[PDB]
Amino acid sequence: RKNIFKGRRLNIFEPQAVTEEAPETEAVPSLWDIEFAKQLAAVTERPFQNGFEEMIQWTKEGKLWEFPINNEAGFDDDGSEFHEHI
Amino acid sequence: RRKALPPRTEKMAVDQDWPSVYPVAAPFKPSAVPLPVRMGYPVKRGVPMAKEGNLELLKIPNFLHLTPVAIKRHCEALKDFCTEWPAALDSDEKCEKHFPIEIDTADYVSAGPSIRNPKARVVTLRVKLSSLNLDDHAKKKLIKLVGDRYCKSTDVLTIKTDRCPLKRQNYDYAVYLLTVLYHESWKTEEWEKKKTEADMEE
Amino acid sequence: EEVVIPKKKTWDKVAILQALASTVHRDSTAAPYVFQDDPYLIPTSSVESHSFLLAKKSGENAAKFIINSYPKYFQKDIAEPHIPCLMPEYFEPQIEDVSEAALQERIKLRKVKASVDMFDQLLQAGTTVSLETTNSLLDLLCYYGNQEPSANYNHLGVTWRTKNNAERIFALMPEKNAHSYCTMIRGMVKHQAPTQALNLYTVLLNNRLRADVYTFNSLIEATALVVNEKFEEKWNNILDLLKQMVTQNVKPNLQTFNTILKCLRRFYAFGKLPALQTLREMKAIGIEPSLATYHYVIQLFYQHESPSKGSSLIIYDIMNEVMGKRFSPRDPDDDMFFQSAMRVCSSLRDLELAYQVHGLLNTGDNWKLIGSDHRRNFYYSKFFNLLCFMEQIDVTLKWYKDLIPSVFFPHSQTMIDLLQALDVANRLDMVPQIWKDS
Amino acid sequence: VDVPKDMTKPEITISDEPDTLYKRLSVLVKGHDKAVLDSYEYFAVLAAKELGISIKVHEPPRKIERFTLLKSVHIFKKHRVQYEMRTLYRCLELEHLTGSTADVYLEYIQRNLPEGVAMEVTKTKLEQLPEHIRKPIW
Amino acid sequence: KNRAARVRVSKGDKPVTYEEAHAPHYIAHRKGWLSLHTGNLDGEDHAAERTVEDVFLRKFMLGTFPGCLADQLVLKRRANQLEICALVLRQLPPHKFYFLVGYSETLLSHFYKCPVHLHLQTVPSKVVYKYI
Amino acid sequence: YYVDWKMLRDVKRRKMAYEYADERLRINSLRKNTILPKDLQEVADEEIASLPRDSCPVRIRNRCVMTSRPRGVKRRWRLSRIVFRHLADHGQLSGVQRAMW
Numbered sequence A: 001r002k003n004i005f006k007g008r009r010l011n012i013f014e015p016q017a018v019t020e021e022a023p024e025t026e027a028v029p030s031l032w033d034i035e036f037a038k039q040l041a042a043v044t045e046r047p048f049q050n051g052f053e054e055m056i057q058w059t060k061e062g063k064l065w066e067f068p069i070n071n072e073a074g075f076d077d078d079g080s081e082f083h084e085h086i
Numbered sequence B: 001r002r003k004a005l006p007p008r009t010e011k012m013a014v015d016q017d018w019p020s021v022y023p024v025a026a027p028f029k030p031s032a033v034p035l036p037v038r039m040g041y042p043v044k045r046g047v048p049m050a051k052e053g054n055l056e057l058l059k060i061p062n063f064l065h066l067t068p069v070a071i072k073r074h075c076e077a078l079k080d081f082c083t084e085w086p087a088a089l090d091s092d093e094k095c096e097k098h099f100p101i102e103i104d105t106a107d108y109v110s111a112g113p114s115i116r117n118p119k120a121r122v123v124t125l126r127v128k129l130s131s132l133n134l135d136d137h138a139k140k141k142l143i144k145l146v147g148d149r150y151c152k153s154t155d156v157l158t159i160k161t162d163r164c165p166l167k168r169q170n171y172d173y174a175v176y177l178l179t180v181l182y183h184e185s186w187k188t189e190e191w192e193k194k195k196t197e198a199d200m201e202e
Numbered sequence C: 001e002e003v004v005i006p007k008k009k010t011w012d013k014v015a016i017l018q019a020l021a022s023t024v025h026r027d028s029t030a031a032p033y034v035f036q037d038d039p040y041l042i043p044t045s046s047v048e049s050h051s052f053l054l055a056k057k058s059g060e061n062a063a064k065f066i067i068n069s070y071p072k073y074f075q076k077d078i079a080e081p082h083i084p085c086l087m088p089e090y091f092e093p094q095i096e097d098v099s100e101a102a103l104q105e106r107i108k109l110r111k112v113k114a115s116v117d118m119f120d121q122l123l124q125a126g127t128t129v130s131l132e133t134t135n136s137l138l139d140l141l142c143y144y145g146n147q148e149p150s151a152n153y154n155h156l157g158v159t160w161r162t163k164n165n166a167e168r169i170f171a172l173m174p175e176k177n178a179h180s181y182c183t184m185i186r187g188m189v190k191h192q193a194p195t196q197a198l199n200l201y202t203v204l205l206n207n208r209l210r211a212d213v214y215t216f217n218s219l220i221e222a223t224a225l226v227v228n229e230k231f232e233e234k235w236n237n238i239l240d241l242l243k244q245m246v247t248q249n250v251k252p253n254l255q256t257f258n259t260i261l262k263c264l265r266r267f268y269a270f271g272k273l274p275a276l277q278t279l280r281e282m283k284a285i286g287i288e289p290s291l292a293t294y295h296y297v298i299q300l301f302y303q304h305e306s307p308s309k310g311s312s313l314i315i316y317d318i319m320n321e322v323m324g325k326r327f328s329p330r331d332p333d334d335d336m337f338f339q340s341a342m343r344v345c346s347s348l349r350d351l352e353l354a355y356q357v358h359g360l361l362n363t364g365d366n367w368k369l370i371g372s373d374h375r376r377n378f379y380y381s382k383f384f385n386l387l388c389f390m391e392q393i394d395v396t397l398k399w400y401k402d403l404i405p406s407v408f409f410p411h412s413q414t415m416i417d418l419l420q421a422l423d424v425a426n427r428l429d430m431v432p433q434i435w436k437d438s
Numbered sequence D: 001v002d003v004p005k006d007m008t009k010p011e012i013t014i015s016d017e018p019d020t021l022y023k024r025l026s027v028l029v030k031g032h033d034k035a036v037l038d039s040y041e042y043f044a045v046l047a048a049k050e051l052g053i054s055i056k057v058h059e060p061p062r063k064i065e066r067f068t069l070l071k072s073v074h075i076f077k078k079h080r081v082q083y084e085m086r087t088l089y090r091c092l093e094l095e096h097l098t099g100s101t102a103d104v105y106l107e108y109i110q111r112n113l114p115e116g117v118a119m120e121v122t123k124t125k126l127e128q129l130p131e132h133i134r135k136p137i138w
Numbered sequence E: 001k002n003r004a005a006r007v008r009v010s011k012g013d014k015p016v017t018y019e020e021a022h023a024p025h026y027i028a029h030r031k032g033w034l035s036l037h038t039g040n041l042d043g044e045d046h047a048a049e050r051t052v053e054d055v056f057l058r059k060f061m062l063g064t065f066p067g068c069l070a071d072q073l074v075l076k077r078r079a080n081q082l083e084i085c086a087l088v089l090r091q092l093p094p095h096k097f098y099f100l101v102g103y104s105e106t107l108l109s110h111f112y113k114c115p116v117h118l119h120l121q122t123v124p125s126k127v128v129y130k131y132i
Numbered sequence F: 001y002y003v004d005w006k007m008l009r010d011v012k013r014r015k016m017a018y019e020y021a022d023e024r025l026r027i028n029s030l031r032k033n034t035i036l037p038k039d040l041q042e043v044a045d046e047e048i049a050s051l052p053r054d055s056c057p058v059r060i061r062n063r064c065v066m067t068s069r070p071r072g073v074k075r076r077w078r079l080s081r082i083v084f085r086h087l088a089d090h091g092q093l094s095g096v097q098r099a100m101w
């Protein structure tokens, strides 16, 4: 009749209100974190189960076009306004 | 050796939903289609060939994935990604009154590994001159300045730009021409008084 | 003005397909999409599925071997926009000169023999080497034990060796930081060598260098495996490490608690009460338990005991807590929860409990966490057997058609259970069709 | 009976940028076989009606390209074998279509395009006067 | 006498499939085109690149599946993806068919820099339309 | 291997033209304009003719990409007239049919 989440716990660790304010993502990537990403993603990913699911994976990967089609996709011409050409 | 299993057509239900079988565009699979369909020119005394092992039913672009039952289901889910057209802009005349500039752009889709079409960089900007603030002198100069781009019957000004590689650069260039042609029609320069009686439009 | 411009709607470029993907569900009579729809190529048994699918997977590796073997035959590009995921890759070092910049290329290309040979030449050349690069080189060598990874083509016992390059380079390090000790301890525990890891931790404490989150994760497993003391002595050591963790102000992650519960499975009786204490601590800290966390809890309380009074209380509280939740992957062992949850339902013989487990699996994308093929077959093996007698044959047949053969191929014993259900339900007219499907 | 409960998860973030209004959208599909274009028009019209677009469909006149090649591989220039490429046309006009509705309609149309046809879109976007023209500057 | 893509009459003992039993002047009258793409439309460019790629697949698929190919391929080009439809005899074991399907899909996709779809329909023998 | 030695020569000729395409264009601009002094134009003629012979656009020859037939080649498909019929009569080209009217 007693919930497993209610009762005595370990009080050694204080309850932390917030996480780290500035994560160190812009630094040298630890090898184990990259390995953790591989292990977490590989289990999650499964072989394609439907035609639609194969499209969305391809679209993210870049195999397929980004509909609706714009013929200038991926070519910004060095980000130059019309003045550098006129 | 290995044998051939019976086709799934036998196990297909009478009232099963078709679009679940074909979610995307797929070629005509004879085992996956319960419909007995025959095509091909018949023999002198015979019937057209069956749906198994027939190439004529494979060349055709099938529309099994766009059945009307599936179309309503497909479109209704897409209705979330939409916003209504303002009701006040019902008549086309009011559209001109509240929006006097229309811009024409083109996008091209073709089968291949590349999307780059050099004909997609064109931008056509059309402006009705009656909606601007041109004076009697300024309007006459603008017509004499822009040349053949102005139609005397419909009073529409068409500016077409092709030099910029991208449609966004052409659009910025096209609007640049419109604004510089208006700020220049109001500068009554000194030499403008040297008008000849044969150059008068009226 | 009498016109109001409506605000635009912004969506990602792949969300439009997912809207259409929602309308279409799985097909009952269709073979898995990975395999061809042709009858001659449709798999006929669970044995064929492993043979067929791995044959196709070997095809991709076979082709990619050719692509990487002869890069010059695939350098032509006619793709617009560019697709960087189709260009051939390179494994040989693009720079054959002896320099620090070229050394980093071999480190990042999963090359160990090339990196160690080049590093020795760099040291003999007299040029200085950055500490982070030295640490990065150690991590590559420590993880594989100074060996090469698994490539396409060129258990018992301690894999860690005393005469190893990892210890040799570590001693040669002029400056050693906290990370250098942290990565060395984790490798030792991973390679079933916790005796050296615990000794290094004592040296780490003498250096007054704080340990990161992952270091305490390995230490807790290390302390239990090193010695064979009683639970009370082990528990004191476990609590001792946690007190040291607070002193350095280190917040444990989700995996820190999961490995504790997994190791507590050995103490099938004495660890029942301490396991609940750790679970409540996770809620207080803020780390939401994943599927793997509940997986170790149910198995610890589930033993070969006739009453199962404690286990019933465990599962009932969990399922209500997990009800109506979508779970994201957060642990390498998250895939083993669904198979283990069905094991509990097999003994308890609770059809209603199984539906809550199965209902959770079908919510959102939680179905991707079922596990491997044999785990999927086993998960549906226990679940389908429960559907035979616990429910009316009219609904059991509907689940029989939907689950088989679209999801899994039935086992011989599973067919026996189906036959028993028909006999009890006083229906023998379906027997000829069962044999045909058999 | 067993179905995946609530397998839908798209998000539509409504930002603050005003939507783009298109005065009229023109779609011109070109292909080799009339039957494919006849079916494609029905698919486009049915989807357009459900979204509430009030489209109009007309058939532009077709054009035929012809050329002549020699028959044999040596001499015999009095015998020719001719060939012909037929491009059939079909135009679907869209009027009073917002930018947000334009994006979904086009991409839904484009993804279901048959292999034997292609299309061109002419979008007549409308907008107010430029800032320099609107704001009085001599 | 015309001889383009024709099979000559020889008694009544030689089987002929539907594709080979019709003269070339019957194209777009009784039989369709084995390949469909945008390149040969009225105002569309990039028609030579499609043609050479089409011929290569006629030579690659014929050589990848020796003897077990029934008749000509059907190539459909939608968006940037390439679909290849084939008729294959029941010659190789299913393990080899999936190996070649996996091998063909990866090699062509990394060669033409476009996704490739390979759909197979298996028949017991060559389909006979006339004679026999 | 290209189908013939003649085809190989054309590839070298096209490759050489591409390298000197921009350099030829800049120099050829001086010659084709009458506002520059005649003395400068004579010097330009010497330099433009000092470039390698193969780097000339007019020397490029359009052949068939399959059989390398120097003439009888349709520019759209870049194929010889014999090969084009061979592909078209089998139905292997989309939208190409025997003309009847």
Ligand SMILES: [Mg+2]
Pocket: F003, F004
């Ligand atoms: Mg020769």
Ligand SMILES: [Mg+2]
Pocket: none
């Ligand atoms: Mg001259």
Ligand SMILES: [Mg+2]
Pocket: F058, F059, F060, F061
């Ligand atoms: Mg010439």
